[PDB]
Write an enzyme that holds these catalytic residues in place. Sequence first.
Site, PDB file in Angstrom:
ATOM      1  N   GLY A 106       0.332   8.061  -1.671  1.00  0.00           N
ATOM      2  CA  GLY A 106       0.415   8.294  -3.109  1.00  0.00           C
ATOM      3  C   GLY A 106      -0.652   7.603  -3.934  1.00  0.00           C
ATOM      4  O   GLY A 106      -1.075   8.138  -4.971  1.00  0.00           O
ATOM      5  N   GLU A 107      -1.094   6.415  -3.509  1.00  0.00           N
ATOM      6  CA  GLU A 107      -2.117   5.683  -4.248  1.00  0.00           C
ATOM      7  C   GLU A 107      -3.535   5.978  -3.761  1.00  0.00           C
ATOM      8  O   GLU A 107      -4.459   6.061  -4.578  1.00  0.00           O
ATOM      9  CB  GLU A 107      -1.853   4.171  -4.164  1.00  0.00           C
ATOM     10  CG  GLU A 107      -0.644   3.704  -4.967  1.00  0.00           C
ATOM     11  CD  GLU A 107      -0.258   2.248  -4.713  1.00  0.00           C
ATOM     12  OE1 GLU A 107      -0.553   1.723  -3.610  1.00  0.00           O
ATOM     13  OE2 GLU A 107       0.373   1.639  -5.611  1.00  0.00           O
TER      14      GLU A 107
ATOM     15  N   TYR B  50       0.850  -1.189   0.000  1.00  0.00           N
ATOM     16  CA  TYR B  50       0.000   0.000   0.000  1.00  0.00           C
ATOM     17  C   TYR B  50       0.881   1.233   0.000  1.00  0.00           C
ATOM     18  O   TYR B  50       1.754   1.358   0.856  1.00  0.00           O
ATOM     19  CB  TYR B  50      -0.886   0.101   1.243  1.00  0.00           C
ATOM     20  CG  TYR B  50      -1.819  -1.024   1.595  1.00  0.00           C
ATOM     21  CD1 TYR B  50      -1.336  -2.246   2.050  1.00  0.00           C
ATOM     22  CD2 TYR B  50      -3.198  -0.830   1.562  1.00  0.00           C
ATOM     23  CE1 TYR B  50      -2.205  -3.268   2.411  1.00  0.00           C
ATOM     24  CE2 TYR B  50      -4.074  -1.844   1.917  1.00  0.00           C
ATOM     25  CZ  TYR B  50      -3.567  -3.060   2.343  1.00  0.00           C
ATOM     26  OH  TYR B  50      -4.426  -4.072   2.726  1.00  0.00           O
ATOM     27  N   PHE B  51       0.650   2.143  -0.939  1.00  0.00           N
ATOM     28  CA  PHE B  51       1.183   3.502  -0.815  1.00  0.00           C
ATOM     29  C   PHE B  51      -0.019   4.323  -0.354  1.00  0.00           C
ATOM     30  O   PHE B  51      -0.792   4.827  -1.169  1.00  0.00           O
ATOM     31  CB  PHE B  51       1.762   4.023  -2.130  1.00  0.00           C
ATOM     32  CG  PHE B  51       3.052   3.368  -2.551  1.00  0.00           C
ATOM     33  CD1 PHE B  51       3.047   2.115  -3.155  1.00  0.00           C
ATOM     34  CD2 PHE B  51       4.272   4.013  -2.366  1.00  0.00           C
ATOM     35  CE1 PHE B  51       4.235   1.517  -3.564  1.00  0.00           C
ATOM     36  CE2 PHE B  51       5.467   3.416  -2.778  1.00  0.00           C
ATOM     37  CZ  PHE B  51       5.444   2.165  -3.370  1.00  0.00           C
ATOM     38  N   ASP B  52      -0.211   4.423   0.966  1.00  0.00           N
ATOM     39  CA  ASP B  52      -1.450   5.028   1.456  1.00  0.00           C
ATOM     40  C   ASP B  52      -1.559   6.480   1.006  1.00  0.00           C
ATOM     41  O   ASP B  52      -2.641   6.944   0.628  1.00  0.00           O
ATOM     42  CB  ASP B  52      -1.532   4.927   2.982  1.00  0.00           C
ATOM     43  CG  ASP B  52      -1.948   3.536   3.449  1.00  0.00           C
ATOM     44  OD1 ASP B  52      -2.705   2.865   2.720  1.00  0.00           O
ATOM     45  OD2 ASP B  52      -1.517   3.116   4.537  1.00  0.00           O
TER      46      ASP B  52
ATOM     47  N   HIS C 206       5.390  -0.588   8.163  1.00  0.00           N
ATOM     48  CA  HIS C 206       4.690   0.671   7.902  1.00  0.00           C
ATOM     49  C   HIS C 206       5.764   1.736   7.845  1.00  0.00           C
ATOM     50  O   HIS C 206       6.327   2.080   8.882  1.00  0.00           O
ATOM     51  CB  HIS C 206       3.690   1.042   9.005  1.00  0.00           C
ATOM     52  CG  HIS C 206       2.686  -0.018   9.339  1.00  0.00           C
ATOM     53  ND1 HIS C 206       1.422  -0.042   8.788  1.00  0.00           N
ATOM     54  CD2 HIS C 206       2.741  -1.061  10.203  1.00  0.00           C
ATOM     55  CE1 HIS C 206       0.748  -1.062   9.285  1.00  0.00           C
ATOM     56  NE2 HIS C 206       1.523  -1.689  10.151  1.00  0.00           N
TER      57      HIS C 206
ATOM     58  N   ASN D  84      -8.677  -1.703   6.647  1.00  0.00           N
ATOM     59  CA  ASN D  84      -8.568  -2.249   8.005  1.00  0.00           C
ATOM     60  C   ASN D  84      -7.708  -1.408   8.947  1.00  0.00           C
ATOM     61  O   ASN D  84      -7.830  -1.547  10.162  1.00  0.00           O
ATOM     62  CB  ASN D  84      -8.008  -3.676   7.973  1.00  0.00           C
ATOM     63  CG  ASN D  84      -6.748  -3.773   7.161  1.00  0.00           C
ATOM     64  OD1 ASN D  84      -6.772  -3.525   5.949  1.00  0.00           O
ATOM     65  ND2 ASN D  84      -5.622  -4.115   7.815  1.00  0.00           N
ATOM     66  N   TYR D  85      -6.857  -0.540   8.394  1.00  0.00           N
ATOM     67  CA  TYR D  85      -5.926   0.204   9.227  1.00  0.00           C
ATOM     68  C   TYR D  85      -6.380   1.630   9.479  1.00  0.00           C
ATOM     69  O   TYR D  85      -7.054   2.308   8.715  1.00  0.00           O
ATOM     70  CB  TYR D  85      -4.487   0.296   8.668  1.00  0.00           C
ATOM     71  CG  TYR D  85      -3.669  -0.864   9.134  1.00  0.00           C
ATOM     72  CD1 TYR D  85      -3.087  -1.758   8.227  1.00  0.00           C
ATOM     73  CD2 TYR D  85      -3.482  -1.077  10.498  1.00  0.00           C
ATOM     74  CE1 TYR D  85      -2.323  -2.856   8.675  1.00  0.00           C
ATOM     75  CE2 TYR D  85      -2.724  -2.151  10.988  1.00  0.00           C
ATOM     76  CZ  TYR D  85      -2.138  -3.040  10.045  1.00  0.00           C
ATOM     77  OH  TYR D  85      -1.387  -4.127  10.456  1.00  0.00           O
TER      78      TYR D  85
HETATM   79 CU   LIG Z   1       1.029  -3.408  11.163  1.00  0.00          CU
END
Ligand SMILES: [Cu+2]
Lengths: 620, 620
Positions: free
Chosen positions: B292-293, B288-290, B425, B373-374
């Site tokens: 940039g994506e 995941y690029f939280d 992360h 989920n995060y």
């Molecule tokens: Cu974690």
Amino acid sequence: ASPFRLASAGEISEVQGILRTAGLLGPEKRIAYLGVLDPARGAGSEAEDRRFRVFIHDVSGARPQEVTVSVTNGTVISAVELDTAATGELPVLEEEFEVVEQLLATDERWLKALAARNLDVSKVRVAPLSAGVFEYAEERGRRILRGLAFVQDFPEDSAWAHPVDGLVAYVDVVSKEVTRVIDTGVFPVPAEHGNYTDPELTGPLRTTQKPISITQPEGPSFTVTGGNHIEWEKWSLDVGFDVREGVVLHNIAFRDGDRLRPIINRASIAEMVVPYGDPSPIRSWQNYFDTGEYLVGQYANSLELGCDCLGDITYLSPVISDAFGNPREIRNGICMHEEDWGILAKHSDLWSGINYTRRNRRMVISFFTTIGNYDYGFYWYLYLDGTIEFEAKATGVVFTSAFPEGGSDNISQLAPGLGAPFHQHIFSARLDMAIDGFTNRVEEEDVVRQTMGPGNERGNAFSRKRTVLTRESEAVREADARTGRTWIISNPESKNRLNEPVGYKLHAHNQPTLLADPGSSIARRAAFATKDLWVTRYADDERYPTGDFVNQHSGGAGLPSYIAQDRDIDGQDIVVWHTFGLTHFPRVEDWPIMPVDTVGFKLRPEGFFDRSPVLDVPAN
Amino acid sequence: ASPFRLASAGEISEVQGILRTAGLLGPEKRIAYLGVLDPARGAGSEAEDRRFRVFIHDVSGARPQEVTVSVTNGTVISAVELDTAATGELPVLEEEFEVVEQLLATDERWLKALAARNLDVSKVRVAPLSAGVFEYAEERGRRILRGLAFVQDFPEDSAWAHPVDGLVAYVDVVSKEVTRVIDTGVFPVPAEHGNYTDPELTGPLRTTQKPISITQPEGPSFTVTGGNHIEWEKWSLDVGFDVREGVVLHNIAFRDGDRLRPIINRASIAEMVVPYGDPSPIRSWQNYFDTGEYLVGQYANSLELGCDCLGDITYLSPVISDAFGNPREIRNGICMHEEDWGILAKHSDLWSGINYTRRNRRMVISFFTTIGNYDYGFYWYLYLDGTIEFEAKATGVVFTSAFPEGGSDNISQLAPGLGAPFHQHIFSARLDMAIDGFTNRVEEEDVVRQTMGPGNERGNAFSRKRTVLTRESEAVREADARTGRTWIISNPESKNRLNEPVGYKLHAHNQPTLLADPGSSIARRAAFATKDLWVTRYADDERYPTGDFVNQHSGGAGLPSYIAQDRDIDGQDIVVWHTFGLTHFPRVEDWPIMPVDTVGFKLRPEGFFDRSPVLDVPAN
Ligand SMILES: [Cu+2]
Ligand SMILES: [Cu+2]
Ligand code: NA
Ligand code: NA
Ligand code: NA
Ligand code: NA
């Protein structure tokens, strides 16, 4: 009724009477250390015997003694004469501090040195510092303090702003002789003052800070019973106090359903050393063992409500002995309170529609000590989620010197002509572990990088490895931040519901350890500080990483001698010793009084519980 | 009037109208990103021009566009067609998330896989995940999402407890085609629920927690003017908000006497990547690029008083654009408050008789985002003593898998049959530095150990060394915790009263960087994450460490291409990029909802001030 209760004034008075009647406390004797002994292993017989250990100094030059007394029975259990050239000198006495300045004031060499600098002897304060062990053969078996001078321009002046560099004296505090006065040359005494309450320095005080009011309308969530037994949010523990170590935590346990589960049997800061890194002969001997040489508990501050401790505070006032065996209360010496600690857990779930937030809190147990120019806060934290954390807070006034014209590789400049030598502040935490009982082991856990190839075709996998430490000879470990190294303390005979051994993970800050050359005096006397982690097999008499008598002890005692026994530590009663510290290159902002800097460590559960232990925290 | 003010709903409405009239916002178009452009360097002409950058997606398959608009003048400044096979795809759209589950529900291969597992398609949730770039030639230039399945037993059930392992599908979200369905075998779906609000799981809630009441009877000490300009305890700054980066801090400055002294021109978290370390083909593509994506700002939570933010809270409600150009307010999306922060400075002086204690406080600026989920909290702290700190808080529900019989080197077991793959992360902080102005340089500072010998006869000395980074090619640095490595940002043309350049020291946590094989796809796309520190020369278009278009971009863009210019950074307008992160081996205690874990960094003054900057703090 609890064997872990704090020493009472009545117990200390009884100790005094027992020593006096036994002929051990004449007018020439001084108590240099007094403290309660912990129960021995297997005290499940209720046969309580409150025993005290006493170090007795003799101001006439007779041999000191180590004495153990039972206040329950009113008897001397044992009394041993000490050969201090062999096993070390007794801790420094508060009354010896003033002897140094008074003795130097009448010494012709000292007065000539002050006259050359045009300093009035009445204005010269002398910092009385521990001596260590160096090249001076005449010091073996004598009680020596070394003195460094500072000028106090007027009674309320901060003498630390005015170091008298180039000058040091050595003093035999028993024979009351000045053994050596060393004058390496005249340095200008820095002239700017450092009075941090002077309006000319502070400027007008800020009027912009509005009050923060922290209150607990229904009182605190913890209970205190038996004087020092705390129950808080499933935690249970006893808060002890020792004049050498300060606050000691006993019997740390967590109530998991209907089981009280032990975690740590005894936690303490068992030594702390402050080595200086200036090679000038005026200071190259300078190393403080604040715990082992000075005894940090006896200089604990009385903590003021609203200033030192804010909120709904519960105080403990521990009792210690003075040098004559009289009880002395340290009023409000320990603060206990709970603190909000932000968000504990949070999730907003798209699919279920449930939004969930819970807040964290911690229980704080703290005290503050002052040793000359430095002030240290010791903070123990318990969190809702099972985390245990220690934090040291360093403040006070930095130790100063002249700043040499042409600069220095080992001293920072703080003000015109004013230097601050480089130094470290290194702590040793002694953690007598009891993860679900006493059969414990330590594993070292490293991250493992994997190569792209068969079974890892996209080159994304990574793993971890755990190495069990099985014997003391292999249990001296160093940090490796780059590989994410941590240590797990587990109980191989107690498994969680997934059939994995229960454990706790130690997370270090991975700060540098002792920087001194390995062949130095300080590296030999503070060997514990050269490595991040040691594991020993529990033994009653292995209490301190530096040994029992640190002052002027030649070296090697403590942890290096303990681990030579090469004992089994794989599923046994073990003790973890963690070294951690601050390396201090003083900055201009540290002057004239230093803002707090911190260092510490924490332990987090690692499969100790069968699931998150904070599912039953309410929404608030 | 300030150019750094938050975007208003009126500005966004004007942008929509300008795009529509220009023919750029037909019914087939979607806004994938919209944000205000910062003023260019040298805006001291007051000629304000509020410009917005827009990424425009076309749901019919036409080429997307990058457009810049001036709302001040009402004009399109530039509009460029994008070749996405070359420069990357646009960020994922919120409306594409639901397309994945709906498309799979009618695909014969997907239905056969679910039938083999006896799962009702109506109960199967699909997590829509970014695709990255791997071996599938047919994906080049197409917008792909990959889907992983979880079972929801009932509408309020936590689907994360029931992963459907062995199954993954790839979906072209523009052509609405399922390109591949991969079924590697049937794993049992873990059966235990993970409903952390179910009384059967939580047990009875605790009744032991008593209230902590934090109030400010006279209000807070900070002021907010112009919507987003904060003044607090000599600090001055502007709080921005961008849909990609989230909270952005501008113009961080400190009022030192009568001078407003700049420190940081712009601070942001400019990328964050979550790489998974499980080599199973079901998940080995998962990164995941939280930022940039997905764009972390658009998923910001509305923060609730008393639960998310406690105390006297001042909220900001930033406005963003929806996919059609309509303004959308994130109500109470940013919390601002001050917090007590323990003891600031303390000394009890024997010689002067003065006892001195002052308390510390910090200003907190925070927001929380939820991506599947995060859940992540982003916290910026300003302290009285000049320290600036960032902290990320990670919580939510861990991503799950089956736990294979016979175990795994890359997956933790959380519950019977339930696994959690290892992952990291990792964050990138972009710090556009302005220490006393824009002429800055970076020095790397290491501790130096010295050998016992001439000039160091007692073997106690230690020192430090500083190395200036002069060109971008030498400005890619790694941590070294063992040598106490830090980095100093200084201004060589601005000196303190001791004639030393003013500076700030960056203290890292020294956690592991990216673990993936250097030849992996993720190491190429997240090259920033392989090193702890990068320094570049400022340029308007070098905004993100991963480039402008991260989604399905083949790699190399961003920092590796910037530093190839090998520009002068010795006393120039420079940008520091700091990589820091958490390596997560999930523990049983992380399930079924994870207690917060944290990581961050801080900057402390290093001879920036002429003495401690908090001498004028009052006694309280
Ligand atoms: Cu974690
Ligand atoms: Cu220090
Ligand atoms: Na000896
Ligand atoms: Na033990
Ligand atoms: Na490309
Ligand atoms: Na800059």
